[PDB]
Design a protein around this ligand. Structure first.
Ligand SMILES: Cc1cc2nc3c(=O)[nH]c(=O)nc-3n(C[C@H](O)[C@H](O)[C@H](O)COP(=O)(O)O)c2cc1C
Ligand SMILES: C/C(=C\COC(=O)C(C)C)CC/C(C)=C/Cc1c(O)c(Cl)c(C)c(C=O)c1O
Ligand SMILES: O=C(O)c1cc(=O)[nH]c(=O)[nH]1
Length: 366
């Protein structure tokens, strides 16, 4: 490990977290990232890390999860940090404020965060114009193996959820390599009920019809992002609908409304979704389940508690073609990205994989 990893993780990040409230810290991180003030990313991506999935090349399989760059303000800075792909959002159709502050909480003793942002969003129009300002730059980045995802949400007061997602497809679909139908936020009343069979089939049929209506060059993959808190029945139903409709992939998982035994943080009983280390294995097991239920035929982006190459490889072997992280970045800072990639490469070599692709779903073949 480099000196930068150690300096950020042991000294700089904990010191700055001691000085700044969580949401102020988030806002500054977005600002710093957008301005390119981040440290120099030393790690040069080897060919072993390249993945071809969702109609795209990914230079490396480590992405930034939704919720960091909600409004598409820091996309280029995130690629500079060494992410293989960037997901922005969630974006709602109309601007909305989200929940009252405070609404994000650190659990340092658990290496976890709880948030109840409630889809604070600049709205589709603002994000559309922000992405349009760099659309050709993104086209080159995508061609270079650096794709962009856009995660779509719904407004608090909307009377037609499916129409909110349809609007998102129409407005941001033409600017995205993939879209995410986020039906798994724990912070919007009734949202997770859209994961149910009948509601999901009707919602996703409408989303896919809208996507299919876009011009070929502007036609994104469509993925559904699911909760870690689903029943076995819920998961079976989602798998069935995904296969019936030809949904392009799954993002597994969002934050958990569970509070695993053993959390130590003083703020453990705050309302919201829990992320970071306590979510890690719940997410990995959900990936494993969804891979098996879809016969390994549906690409999965694995997310929840990834902080190391081992964490990444466990999700890949469970069935993820790509992984994302967020909470680890908040604790260990920008050097965590290079750390995960370097460790992942080393472990792939150690376990006799030719590359990431060879390891996808490997546990199921043991
Ligand atoms: C502060 C915060 C805000 C988030 N906002 C969103 C969001 O807007 N949309 C979304 O799909 N997921 C959101 N997430 C969930 C992350 O994308 C990810 O699924 C989850 O945090 C698990 O990954 P992690 O343990 O690496 O953070 C958010 C997570 C956090 C911690
Ligand atoms: C600009 C700062 C550190 C530099 O590191 C970064 O920019 C990384 C996090 C992208 C200081 C602000 C801090 C300590 C941010 C860490 C942090 C946080 O402490 C918390 Cl709680 C959250 C929710 C976020 C969301 O991104 C977060 O980034
Ligand atoms: O905006 C939020 O509250 C949010 C959305 C989401 O999908 N997941 C999450 O943990 N928080």
């Amino acid at each position: 490990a480099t000196g930068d990893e150690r300096f950020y993780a042991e000294h700089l990040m904990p010191t700055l977290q001691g000085l700044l409230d969580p949401e102020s810290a988030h806002r500054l991180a977005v600002r710093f990232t957008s301005l390119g003030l981040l440290p120099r990313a030393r790690f040069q991506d080897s060919d072993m890390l390249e993945v071809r999935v969702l109609g795209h090349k990914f230079r490396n399989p480590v992405g930034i999860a939704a919720g960091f760059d909600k409004h598409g303000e820091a996309v280029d800075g995130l690629y500079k940090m060494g992410f293989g792909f960037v997901e922005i959002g969630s974006v709602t159709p109309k601007p909305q404020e989200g929940n009252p502050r405070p609404r994000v909480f650190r659990l340092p003793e658990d290496q976890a965060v709880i948030n109840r942002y409630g889809f604070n969003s600049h709205g589709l129009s603002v994000v559309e114009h922000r992405l349009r300002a760099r659309q050709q730059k993104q086209a080159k980045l995508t061609e270079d193996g650096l794709p962009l995802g856009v995660n779509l949400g719904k407004n608090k007061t909307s009377v037609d959820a499916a129409e909110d997602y349809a609007e998102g497809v129409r407005v941001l679909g033409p600017l995205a390599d993939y879209l995410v139908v986020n039906v798994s936020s724990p912070n919007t009343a009734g949202l997770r009920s859209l994961q149910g069979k009948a509601e999901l089939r009707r919602l996703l049929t409408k989303v896919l019809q809208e996507r299919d209506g876009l011009r070929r060059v502007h036609r994104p993959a469509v993925l559904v992002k699911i909760a870690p808190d689903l029943t076995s029945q819920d998961k079976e139903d989602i798998a069935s609908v995904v296969k019936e409709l030809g949904i392009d992939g799954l993002i597994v998982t969002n934050t958990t409304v569970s509070r695993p035994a053993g959390l130590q943080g003083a703020l453990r009983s705050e309302t919201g979704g829990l992320s970071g280390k306590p979510l890690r294995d719940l997410s990995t097991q959900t990936i494993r389940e969804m891979y098996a239920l879809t016969q390994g035929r549906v690409p999965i982006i694995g997310v929840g508690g990834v902080s190391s190459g081992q964490d990444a490889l466990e999700k890949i072997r469970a069935g993820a073609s790509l992984v994302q992280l967020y909470t680890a970045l908040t604790f260990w800072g920008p050097p965590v990205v290079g750390k995960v990639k370097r460790e992942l490469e080393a472990l792939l070599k150690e376990q006799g994989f030719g590359g990431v692709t060879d390891a996808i779903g490997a546990d199921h073949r043991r």
